[PDB]
From a paper:
Abundant filamentous inclusions of [name] are characteristic of more than 20 neurodegenerative diseases that are collectively termed tauopathies. Six [name] isoforms that range from 352 to 441 amino acids in length are expressed in adult human brain from a single gene by alternative mRNA splicing. [name] filaments consist of a structured core made mostly of the repeat domain, with less structured N- and C-terminal regions forming the fuzzy coat. Here, we report in vitro assembly conditions with recombinant [name] that replicate the structures of filaments from both Alzheimer’s disease (AD) and chronic traumatic encephalopathy (CTE), as determined by cryo-EM.
We found that reducing the shaking speed from 700 to 200 rpm was important for the formation of filaments with the AD fold by [name] (297–391). To show that this was not only the case for [name] (297–391), we assembled [name] (258–391) and [name] (297–394) with a shaking speed of 700 rpm. For [name] (297–394), besides structures similar to those formed by [name] (297–391) at 700 rpm, we observed an additional filament with pseudo-21 helical screw symmetry that comprised four protofilaments (filament type 34).
Residue numbers in the entry:
A (entry chain A), B (entry chain C), C (entry chain B), D (entry chain E), E (entry chain F), F (entry chain D), ...: 304 to 378
Write the structure that this text describes.
């Protein structure tokens, strides 16, 4: 008498992660038409101002891919 | 007498995550038509201001992919 | 006498996650037509102001994919 | 006697033209769920056919911008 | 006696043309789920066919911008 | 007696033309999930077929910008 | 007993095909009698015109002859 | 007993194909009598014109002859 | 007993193909009688023209003759 | 005193003669289809006969062109 | 005193004669299709016959061109 | 005193004659398709015949061109 065994599992799967700011930004202040223009700014004590500025702030403690796998046969 | 065994599970799945700011932004203040223009700013004491500014703030814990799998055969 | 066994489950599934801000933004204050214009800002004490301004705050815990699976045969 | 003349017409206009195909289309045939599917096509003699398709062709004669202007002063 | 003349017409205009294929199309045939799928095709004599397809062709005469201007002063 | 003349027409304009194929197409045939798939194509005599395809062709006469201008002063 | 067999089908045919442009055309513009003639032609901008012309273009994939024949005797 | 067989099918045929441009054209512009003649042509910008011309082009993807024949005797 | 077989199929046919441009054209522009003649032609910018011309081009993918024949005798 | 003479008559005429039988001849008796052919003719004594025959008889005196002309100047 | 003479008549005319039969002949009797052929003719005494024949008979005196001219100047 | 003479008549004319038979002949009797062939003719005493024959007979006196010209100047 006799025995015959074949053992061969297969993994062909695929996995993706994408994280953070993935978009697009278009910013354009003051693109007008004017004949005569005049601007006068006067700032004194502990003043703060932002005029036509852009701040992009991104951080990502996230995001890993992880796998644990175990195979065994005994006879 | 005889015995015959074949063991082969298969994984062909696919997995995706996308996280955070995924949109698109268009910003354009003050793009007019004017003959005569005048702007006068006078700021004195502990003043804060924003004029035409863009702030994008993004953060992302998590957003990962995790798999655990275990196989055995015994005879 | 004899025995004959075949063992092969299969996974062909797919999974998707999309999380956060997904829209599109269009913002455009002050794009008019005027002959004569004058603007006059006068701030003394502890003023906070925003004339036209855009900010996007996005944050996203979780949003991930998790799978656990186990197979055994005993004969 | 004396004379003083000042001559200054001004143009501050804007002009735009957009021509052709600008719209939005969504088309998605046959995207179902079924256990067993079979298809059996047999086309013999001078046959014309279309299955799940879209046609886009564009001609633009027109759509330009034109201006003519004249200025005269005689003393 | 005396005379003084000042002559200064001004142009501040802007002009734009966009012509042809600018829109949005989404097309996605056959994107289903099935266990068993079979297809037999048999095309014999003077056969023309389209399956799952999209056609894009563009011609643009015109779309241009043109300006003519004349200035005269005679004393 | 005396005369003084000042002559200074000014042009500050801007002009744009864009012509042809600029829009968005998304095309994706056959993107499904299946366990068993078979296809059997049998074509004979004067057969023309398109399966899953996309065609792109562009011709542009015109789209140009043209300006003519003349100035004359006579004393 | 006895048998005698004679087998002789006969074909004496003729077959003809003529395809495309076979007809008769007479064209003869401007063939007159005149004492004095003068012609002034002045074309500026994006003009198309025709005077006294003839167009001949021919496509023929078709028009062939085909025959299939089979003979069998079994004793 | 006895047998005699005679087997002699006969083909005496003829077959013809003629394809494309076979017809008759007569063309004769301008053929007059005149004492004084003058022609003045002034063509400036993006003009196309035809005067007294003839165009001849031919494509023939087929027009062929084909025959298939089979003979069998079995005793 | 006895048997006698005679086997002799015969082919005496004829086959012809002619493809392309075979017909008759007569062309004769301008063929008059005149005492005084003048022609003045003045062409500037991106102009195309034809005067009294003839164009001839031919392509032939088809037009062949094909025969297949088989004979079998078994005793 | 003085005398000034110029003498120049001009001939630009054209003349044509065409005379007789103006065609081309096509003749084809007996081109039929028949299974079995037999025809019976019995002529004894001084018979004359014509069957399917063509006689073309043409003759042309004259038909020519003649011109006679004379010039003189005397002083 | 003085005398000035110029003498120059001119002939630019043209003359044509065509007479008789100049055409083309096609003759083809008896080109039919027949299985079995026989014809029976019995002619005995001083018989004349024509069957399917072509006679073309042409003759042409004259048809020529003649010109006579004379010039003189006497002083 | 003085005299000035110039004497120069000019001939640029042209003359054509065509007379007789100049053509092309195609003759082809008896080119048929037949399985079995026979013809029976019995002619005895002073018989004449022609069957499918071609006779072409041409003769042409004249057809020529003649010119006579004479010039003189006397002083």
């Amino acid at each position: 008498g006799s025995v015959q065994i074949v053992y061969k599992p297969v993994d062909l799967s695929k996995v993706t992660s994408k994280c953070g700011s993935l978009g697009n930004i278009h910013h354009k202040p003051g693109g007008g038409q004017v004949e005569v223009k005049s601007e006068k700014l006067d700032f004194k004590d502990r003043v703060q101002s932002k005029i036509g500025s852009l701040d992009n702030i991104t951080h990502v403690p996230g995001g890993g891919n992880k796998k644990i796998e175990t195979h065994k046969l005994t006879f």
